[PDB]
Design a binder for this molecule. Structure first.
Ligand SMILES: CC(C)(COP(=O)(O)O)[C@@H](O)C(=O)NCCC(=O)NCCS
Ligand SMILES: CC(C)(COP(=O)(O)O)[C@@H](O)C(=O)NCCC(=O)NCCS
Ligand SMILES: CC(C)(COP(=O)(O)O)[C@@H](O)C(=O)NCCC(=O)NCCS
Ligand SMILES: CC(C)(COP(=O)(O)O)[C@@H](O)C(=O)NCCC(=O)NCCS
Lengths: 157, 154, 154, 154, 154, 157
């Protein structure tokens, strides 16, 4: 009954995210990846595409499932009877903002946030920077799971 | 005749902001909360009311709106000190950059003070965002602002 | 079945550490508080006793002394996770370096959690230094500790 | 033979950027200032002209426009190093992320240099914003720029 | 009757420190530089002289030595405000931790102010270290301190 | 005539240091590694040992040489007619102190400091942390050059 939610926009999911999912999956009895959607801001990928990319890359994790949602993250967490958020840290993370949100989320809902640093190899990739580099021809193939690289280049072209 | 100006957009004013207002009022003879317009969720006119309502008990504090440079606002009132609050998530490096620029162009000092731990994670933006999605931020805002923020959404 | 190790010198344990312990105990099936030693104010056994009393209502947390590599203490108890608290003044860059080292050499993960705002400025060293010079740090330490501390200053 | 690229939007160039240019020009055989574009206050050619005039006494520095990946602009000119300045408010974490990305995808190194204290609080954006509202930022910009800037506010 | 205390070891006092002294004196009615002993390179008695010499032109500033808690020093003089300077290399996270502790145990506010860019990289330790190895730090220390620091080495 | 000094105690040299040496060597016409010695603080390795470990690991760099020194770094730099310092950045670097020293060094001697981040793989090793981990049996072999690992274990035993 131990469990955590891993939230984000995942547009697209990166190997930095995957690294965090795997560590969460190894340490909690269940993990729910929360694909949080802004209903007014279209991303590069649809919810279906975002969810499929994550599923294809997490198939070896039997205790991880993927769901989309919107609104307050702590409502998503508590609706599933959970009380924990696992958030990844990378180079360029706005950690001070993450801390402010962690304190806010604990205050309004009693939900705890656990931060874990992604591996050095995956520490400089982010969804936005990966899309930017790929838009101008840069090779980001080593920084994204296989379910993503193709689809990304397709969107761009 | 010491004095300081406490600037911000106060959209709306939080308990973090009030805490800073209070400390400034207890350490300077005269304090002027500067509501620098730039709309937002509130009109300038009602940002001011909410601050005045939450600070009616501070005799030596008063609230005005401003436009243009903050340093002109401060100096056209014969002062040269700014008091800014620090919370979790404050972009303090940008604050330092503005502090040095402001001292350079006008000789105005900036004093930073940490807000109380209890209000260290509330910010105007975050409180609005949580309150829109239906979370309770009543412990983080003055009662003057709370019932008013709700009525401006619901 | 899940578990984490909460390591530290806990000289003495603070309410900040206890906050972390409680959150780990609430999430993981098993928590082990590892009292890793170096010279301090309290002996290992004194530190352990103080933690045990502070965590009396946490049935799934136990306290042990440790020596050697932290990752050895962790993997020898069949676990693979460390939970470390964050406060004002923590030195997070060093923590990150240690977390990446510990992952590299042993596959052990480190999860960080921010202690509550009320407990975010107490550290063992600062509480001792304040108590030393006659400051009241009772509200920052568990009741068990405050007596045993002041009773060691004499 | 040695060389570096100094990239940026330089809208407009500041004395902070010029400090960096001079230090790069003093160390490397060849420096190329890359004016990488996006909408701003000055056109690319206007930016380039302003940099050329500011760097008139640097015979081994030239200025070119760029589009596409920065690392492409660098490796196409036969170089493999970027020199970036640091000031108060820089966002060094983002710079580090970009530096590690640029090394990963192209083998290009990034060297960072702190601008001199006198020039450490000016940024293009802040100087424009201050000038906009009638602040004197003449001492923070090259003489060539101060005129062309104020002559654009009108 | 406003007032603030400016604490430190001042071993020796730098131009960074003086800059803060001056700003505090221009914004509070009364200022007390607190030289908190803990020896070092100087005796407390001569740390005080060097400060008094460099601040003879500040009428509303005076210098005393203290021991024990800084908050007792401040409050046993009927004040409740501390003014601390910020430079490049200030451990500001520890400063924040002390600021919150000090507010908690005694209700004393801490105001931080950035020192002028020109003195932003001098610190007592670093100036001593450079001056021992024979580098010129005369532009970073008051002339009262300079000739005196030399004579205490050579 | 372009040149830089790479300073440190190098007790022992790490792969993080080596990474920085290589980048400095690639970008400047000459590099001098300055092994700065505190004459009152003995380290784990003698100056000879520190210098040999660096030399054995930098043999493929024809424009790099190694020298020891003490006192002011800027005197070391300027005595060799150079005007540049290249300093590596890693996880845990006291960057604010490095900046203070950079500004101080520019002020008193006109010497410029260029900072470069070591590769992610070598970003969490430091001389002190490597000695500590090795003291308690931890495997740091992947984080140090071959000229170091043996000698280190020898010192410890
Ligand atoms: C109003 C504010 C303090 C920002 O406050 P905020 O962080 O609450 O939004 C800042 O934008 C400001 O000073 N505006 C006035 C224009 C100005 O002075 N610009 C020069 C800054 S150095
Ligand atoms: C005990 C501690 C966790 C630090 O605890 P502390 O910050 O509370 O004093 C750390 O020093 C430690 O891990 N000691 C065990 C030796 C070790 O594992 N060294 C390798 C660190 S990567
Ligand atoms: C132009 C710049 C250096 C930023 O410059 P700026 O901070 O002065 O605006 C950066 O945006 C850039 O590199 N643009 C080129 C596109 C690119 O290379 N993206 C990959 C970055 S890892
Ligand atoms: C003297 C000082 C301000 C440190 O100043 P420094 O940074 O110049 O060395 C600090 O050590 C201090 O406050 N000493 C008095 C003892 C005390 O008050 N301890 C509790 C701090 S919360």
């Amino acid at each position: 009954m131990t469990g955590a939610v891993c939230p984000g926009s995942f547009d697209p999911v990166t190997l930095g995210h995957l690294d965090v999912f795997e560590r969460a999956a190894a340490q909690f009895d269940e993990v729910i990846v929360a694909v949080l959607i802004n209903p007014n801001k279209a991303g590069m990928f649809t919810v279906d595409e975002r969810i499929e990319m994550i599923r294809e890359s997490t198939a070896d994790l039997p205790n991880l499932r993927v769901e989309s949602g919107q609104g307050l993250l702590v409502d998503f967490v508590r609706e599933r009877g959970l009380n924990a958020i696992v958030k990844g840290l990378r180079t360029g993370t706005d950690f001070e903002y993450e801390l402010q949100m962690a304190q806010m989320n604990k205050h309004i809902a009693g939900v705890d946030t656990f931060f874990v640093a992604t591996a050095p190899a995956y520490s400089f990739v982010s969804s936005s920077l990966a899309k930017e580099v790929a838009t101008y021809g840069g090779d980001v193939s080593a920084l994204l799971p296989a379910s993503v690289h193709q689809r990304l280049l397709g969107k761009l072209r």
